[PDB]
Each structure stands twice: as structure tokens, then as C-alpha cells.
Design a protein around this ligand. Structure first.
Ligand SMILES: *C/C=C(C)/C=C/C=C(C)/C=C/C1=C(C)CCCC1(C)C
Ligand SMILES: CCCCCCCC/C=C\CCCCCCCC(=O)O
Ligand SMILES: CCCCCCCC/C=C\CCCCCCCC(=O)O
Ligand SMILES: CCCCCCCC/C=C\CCCCCCCC(=O)O
Ligand SMILES: CCCCCCCC/C=C\CCCCCCCC(=O)O
Ligand SMILES: CCCCCCCC/C=C\CCCCCCCC(=O)O
Ligand SMILES: CCCCCCCC/C=C\CCCCCCCC(=O)O
Ligand SMILES: CCCCCCCC/C=C\CCCCCCCC(=O)O
Ligand SMILES: [Cl-]
Ligand SMILES: [Cl-]
Length: 264
């Protein structure tokens, strides 16, 4: 049901996709160790924001790892090209994983925005419901990326509605609570918003690849887009969230944070 199944791949195409996913694994697990060791310099009220980056690194790292082994499982070099065998490859498992990873990305944002208690719970709940609506309708949509492009588009429109509403909640909370933020991170958080808008928008672009580039090179392009998007939305994003957590920790008088920033 996925366009990947439609084509044979050159050694070049096949190896490049393998390398993309493997590099993705390496980058996420490398970052994981960074978030782990810096977590001790985060104040208790923000430390979970850095823990969530660890959780995202392993979750995303495992899905990329799974995609890579699925890739090599599904294809074998036969008569001069990589051809589909008995096992299958699908991006559908990415969508399932988003059900967990996207709430984590959203939660660590709310935490460094200094949301607490009832507002935290209510905002998270609405955000997670919006995200799940987006992911599920998008998941259903890509089931038709071969059989019914029209249906892919309509489900994608519904998904984009959830996407836009979710982004509006994110933007609203960021620009409203920006003033509460310490150590100059009121400026930093604005770049985080635009990073999210940029990086997250790469995913619906990848979703539409079967509509504007239905060939083996389009398959490569989609994986390339996922790689840019994953690294930007999880790794670069996590580094900024953690930077914001440490800076605010130091500004609130957390001594390990102050000492850590002093060494650099
Ligand atoms: C780490 C993974 C992330 C941040 C994934 C984010 C995914 C999206 C923003 C997906 C958006 C979609 C649309 C807005 C329309 C097409 C269907 C989706 C689910 C791909
Ligand atoms: C930076 C270099 C990126 C690696 C290019 C891989 C494409 C190829 O070798 O076919
Ligand atoms: C934050 C951005 C992260 C970027 C990650 C991607 C790094 C490698 C990107 C690709 C370089 C272009 C490779 C050439 C493609 C050759 C075409 C092919 O052989 O199929
Ligand atoms: C392989 C990676 C090993 C990572 C172990 C690092 C332990 C961190 C110690 C700590 O800060 O609590
Ligand atoms: C095939 C029917 C798909 C139903 C989509 C349900 C939308 C989910 C909304 C938020 C949870
Ligand atoms: C909750 C929203 C659920 C779906 C809204 C209906 C619009 C998209 C469904 C397309 C159905 C189809 O194309 O057969
Ligand atoms: C051409 C690859 C980069 C595309 C970035 C633009 C999409 C996000 C816009 C906000
Ligand atoms: C080419 C440009 C690629 C960008 C690479 C991004 C790398 C990591 C981002 C680190 C986040 C630090 C937040 C900003 C620090 C500060 O505000 O002074
Ligand atoms: Cl604290
Ligand atoms: Cl993920």
C-alpha cells in the first residue's frame, strides 16, 4: 500500500537510504548521552524537560533503527538491483511512534514555559488530543498513497486542520508565557517556535511525495526529508529546550546550573 513497494532500487538509492537511517540512529543515541549527562545541571522544576529529550532520543532512535533493519530485510540485490523480497517496508510505523514522541516534544515545551498544575494538565490534554487527531487522520491518509491519491489528499486536509489548530495552541502559549521566562530565554523560546513551524512542516511535505514524485527518487527524497525533520524537531529542538532549562535553572539560583554555565 506504500509507494516504496512499487519500485526496484539502484545500489546507490538503496545504500543511501540505509546510510540516512543509520546516521539518524547514531545522531539520536549520541545526543541521548549528552542529555543524560547535562540533566544533573537542571533544576528539579525543569529536569523532566531534559529527561523527555532522553525519552525522545531512544524512541526516535529505535524507530529509525527498526526502519533500517526493515529496509535491509525487505530488499535483496537481484539481477542488478535491490528488489522486494518476502518482508515489507513501510513508513506507517513512524506514525504509530509519533503518538508517543509528539506528546513528549510538546510536554517539554510546556515545562520550560513554566506552565504548572491545572493549566499544564489542561493545555497538555488539548495539545495531545490535537496531535493524536493529526497523526491518526494522517496515518489513515497514507494507507491510500498508492491506491487513492484523492483520498490521501482529503485525509491530509483534515490532518492539516489538526496541525494548524495544534500550532495555534503552541504559538499562543509561547507568546503568552514568554514574559515569565528567565535568563533571557524569553528571546530563545521565540526561535524554538519558528524551529517547530519549520521542522514539523517537513512531515506533511514528505506525506505528499507520492502525489508529486511517485518514483524511486521520490522514495529517497521522503527519507531525506524525514532525516532533516527528525534531527531538527527532536535533536536540535531538544538542545534548545535543554539550554533553556539550564539557563532558567541558573537564573532561579540552581547552583549546579550556575557552575555548569560558568565552565563554558
Ligand atoms: C519527531 C516527529 C515529529 C515532530 C512529527 C511530526 C509530524 C507531523 C507534524 C505530521 C503532520 C501531518 C500533516 C500535518 C498532514 C499529513 C499527515 C501528517 C500526519 C504527516
Ligand atoms: C556529504 C556527503 C553525503 C553523502 C552522499 C551519498 C550519496 C551517494 O554516495 O550516492
Ligand atoms: C539538520 C539537517 C540534517 C541533514 C541530514 C542529511 C545529511 C545528508 C544529506 C544528503 C546529501 C545529498 C546526497 C546526494 C544524494 C544522491 C542521490 C542518490 O544516490 O540516491
Ligand atoms: C555508553 C554510554 C554510557 C553512559 C553512562 C554515563 C553515566 C552518567 C553518570 C551520571 O551523570 O549520572
Ligand atoms: C477511519 C476513521 C478515522 C477516525 C479519525 C478519528 C480522529 C481522532 C481525533 C482525536 C483523538
Ligand atoms: C474526525 C474527522 C474524521 C474524518 C472527516 C471526513 C473527511 C475525511 C474522510 C475521507 C473519507 C474518504 O475519503 O473516503
Ligand atoms: C526545501 C526544504 C526546506 C523547506 C522549508 C519550508 C517549509 C517550512 C516553512 C515554514
Ligand atoms: C547551519 C546551522 C545549523 C544549526 C545547528 C544547530 C545546533 C545546535 C543548537 C544549539 C541550541 C543552543 C541555543 C542557542 C544558544 C544561545 O541562545 O546563545
Ligand atoms: Cl526547582
Ligand atoms: Cl519519532
Amino acid at each position: 500500500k506504500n509507494i516504496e513497494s512499487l519500485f526496484d532500487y539502484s545500489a546507490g538509492q538503496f545504500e543511501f537510504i540505509d546510510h540516512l537511517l543509520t546516521m539518524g540512529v547514531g545522531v539520536h543515541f549520541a545526543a541521548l548521552i549528552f542529555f543524560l549527562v547535562v540533566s544533573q545541571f537542571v533544576a528539579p522544576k525543569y529536569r523532566i524537560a531534559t529527561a523527555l529529550s532522553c525519552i525522545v532520543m531512544v524512541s526516535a532512535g529505535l524507530i529509525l533503527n527498526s526502519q533500517a533493519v526493515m529496509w535491509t530485510d525487505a530488499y535483496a540485490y537481484v539481477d542488478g538491483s535491490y528488489q522486494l523480497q518476502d518482508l515489507t517496508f513501510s513508513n506507517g510505523y513512524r506514525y504509530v511512534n509519533w503518538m508517543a514522541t509528539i506528546p513528549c516534544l510538546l510536554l517539554q515545551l510546556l515545562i520550560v514555559l513554566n506552565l504548572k498544575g491545572k493549566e499544564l494538565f489542561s493545555t497538555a490534554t488539548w495539545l495531545i488530543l490535537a496531535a493524536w487527531g493529526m497523526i491518526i487522520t494522517g496515518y489513515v491518509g497514507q494507507l491510500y498513497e498508492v491506491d487513492d491519491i484523492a483520498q490521501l489528499m482529503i485525509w491530509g486536509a483534515v490532518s492539516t486542520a489538526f496541525f494548524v489548530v495544534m500550532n495555534w495552541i503552541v504559538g499562543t502559549k509561547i507568546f503568552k508565557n514568554r514574559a515569565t521566562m528567565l535568563g533571557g530565554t524569553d528571546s530563545t523560546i521565540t526561535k524554538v517556535f519558528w524551529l517547530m513551524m519549520f521542522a514539523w512542516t517537513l512531515y506533511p511535505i514528505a506525506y505528499l511525495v507520492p502525489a508529486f514524485m511517485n518514483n524511486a527518487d521520490g522514495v529517497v527524497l521522503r527519507q531525506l526529508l524525514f532525516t532533516i525533520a527528525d534531527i531538527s524537531s527532536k535533536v536540535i529542538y531538544g538542545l534548545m529546550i535543554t539550554y533553556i532549562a539550564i539557563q532558567q535553572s541558573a537564573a532561579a539560583g540552581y547552583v549546579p546550573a550556575q557552575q555548569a554555565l560558568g565552565r563554558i
